[PDB]
Amino acid sequence: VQLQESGPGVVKPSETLSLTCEVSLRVGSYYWSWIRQSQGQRPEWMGGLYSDTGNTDYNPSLKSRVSLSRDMSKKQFFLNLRSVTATDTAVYFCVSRYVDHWTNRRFDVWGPGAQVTVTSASTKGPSVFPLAPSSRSTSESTAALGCLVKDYFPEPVTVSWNSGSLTSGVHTFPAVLQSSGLYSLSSVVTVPSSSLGTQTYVCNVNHKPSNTKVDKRVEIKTC
Amino acid sequence: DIQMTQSPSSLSASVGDRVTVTCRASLDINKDLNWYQQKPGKAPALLIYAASTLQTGVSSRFSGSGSGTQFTLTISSLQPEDFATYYCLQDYSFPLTFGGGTKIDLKRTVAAPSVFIFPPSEDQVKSGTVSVVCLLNNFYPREASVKWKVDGALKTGNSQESVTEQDSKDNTYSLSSTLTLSSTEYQSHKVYACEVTHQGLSSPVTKSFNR
């Protein structure tokens, strides 16, 4: 068996989130569910059905908004999630659970998962702002600086420093969808504070979906 | 609905250790509990079902026990491929509910975070919305709490955290905690402070700036 989710990756708020699962397949009934999982969170079982009847069970945290169905002739089963909000942004898995009573195997088949993002945003290149190491933080031996990357859509952005020659000490955090409906992240790096003033530091932000590239020099604020 | 309480949220282990993950049910769930392994970007994979039955193709050092409300997953001789997040799943009644997760990572010596706070640049202040970034750099274990204090007053809401995956070279984590504020609300306060608690710190470290 193999499952595969399919459908739009972007859904405007208040609209209906719709996905299909293509089920690969020999005489019986399967329980097909949709289980979703948002970044940094546990999975949430949304609902399931038995393939032979189509009788559904729904998670009470959604019941009014969620609908499940299946088409045995097409080996498909469907999810509809009505009136979505930004918190419905998640990876959606279709999963099949059935025991082969002849061999006594349990079988637990998951699709690879479809990320869906609820937002009104269109494609847009990022804005980049420097995170400058403060003037007083020169008392220590290690300095920290970075770039804030925001207001872009969709993922991904790649961040480099000095066009690739600076990689040691680089930390680029995962992107987070903001209430604006667009993404924001920071990328930071630790450098010798003695190198502040002799070494130039530039963050390179590449956003292929908008064909946008931004460079931002990061320097200390001398008072 | 029943809910699983998973423990611990993270657990530090070395290669070869014997490691225990526990799941607690709010109600009696008989032995209808399943254990899942999940690696980043991948679907959870079933390791144990019916509390103690090992799923086909899963390595034998995975084992489960318990019944009623207390359940345990044990990894006998942890290998590098076991570093992942693990979830328990009850299917005793509807709705199916998952535990909170347990991220098992590579053990290393405790490292307190180096803390830095970044005021927004004037360029971002002129844009009408600003970000204040507090950085916790290269710490271990994952364990970390950040509190925001503005003008001496504890604040809640607004702030968002992100964390990197355990670093491949030094096995540390880094954390950002970011406030998002309008330029007006930003200028309605003077002092912004992030206060950091960690095992490597005997007392909290506060880094603050005046606007």
């Binding site: 399967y30 569910s33 069970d57 025991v99 002849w102 | 005793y92």
Partner: peptide, 8 residues
Amino acid sequence: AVGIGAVF
């Protein structure tokens, strides 16, 4: 206990 099919 719930949501598991059966094939023969």
